[PDB]
Chain length 179, copies 2
């Protein structure tokens, strides 16, 4: 089972998963993954040179980040929100294309820098960045998950990991992954 | 303007509204909102334990769901249809009482579970469930709309939102809403 294999890569050997040691990390060039506090710190975002913010936890609960376009108005940062829940039931894969297109909107300019964040930068946002790496940068899920994890403590839920495995299957068979 | 405020809660920050990521969601306990395909999948309905189905898009066009009582005969599911059109002109509020009474017919039994569906589970059915939450569960429109949206991508048309605001006004003034 592929989800167990992905989990094995993420875990600390004690049955546990390390938590983010910083609020924000550049996980791959010009892509940052972070938490709610960094998303809400516009001066920090500006110093980092962030041009685009994808809120993958948009919403009103204690597990969401209650930002919107207007929060970023006249900061010059371009905003998109995805109202995802961090549950095995939430079909985040329905957003993989939407998110990859947004990341690529940012990166296809040479000065673009994108923050993909959620509440903790741990499950929802890392899933989207991993899917993007697979879909746009031709990384297999293990490679993509591994490079992100090396640069930030992450733990996508098992539902999200299974969605990434299904994605990997499709890209593999379609001949869209680097060997 | 109250409709704009409701829209702001629903939108993704790019001037757009996310579409349903699944065919069916339990939006509040024992109330499901879904599309035409789930309404027409009786074995799925049975596995979910659905006892009641409110078709809020009953009719014969490509924007309606052409089901009827006979479609559910001997499935043991109790059916009601409302031939609503998804337009700002359609007076869905004329059905708010009819629909709330049906939802409450289902929920007033402890094993009842109701699917309120339309063509996409996006505008007509979410409006009825929101009105029900306001009228029967004492939720203000913002609270009701927000809990539904957290559990399913929805976008009631502006006419429907205005009908919900008028409803909220009346319930507020009559002292029928939780502070």
């Amino acid at each position: 089972l592929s989800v167990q294999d992905l989990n094995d890569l993420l875990s600390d050997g004690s049955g546990c998963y390390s938590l983010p040691s910083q609020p924000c990390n550049e996980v791959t060039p010009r892509i940052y993954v972070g938490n709610a506090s960094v998303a809400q710190d516009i001066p920090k975002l500006q110093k980092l040179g962030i041009t685009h913010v994808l809120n993958a936890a948009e919403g009103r609960s204690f597990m969401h980040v209650n930002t919107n376009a207007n929060f970023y108005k006249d900061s010059g940062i371009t905003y998109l929100g995805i109202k995802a829940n961090d549950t095995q039931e939430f079909n985040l894969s329905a957003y993989f294309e939407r998110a990859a297109d947004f990341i690529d909107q940012a990166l296809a300019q040479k000065n673009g820098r994108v923050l993909v964040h959620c509440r903790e930068g741990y499950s929802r946002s890392p899933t989207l960045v991993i899917a993007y790496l697979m879909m746009r940068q031709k990384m297999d899920v293990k490679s993509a998950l591994s490079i992100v994890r090396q640069n930030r403590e992450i733990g996508p839920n098992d539902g999200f990991l299974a969605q990434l495995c299904q994605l990997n299957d499709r890209l593999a068979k379609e001949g869209k992954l680097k060997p």
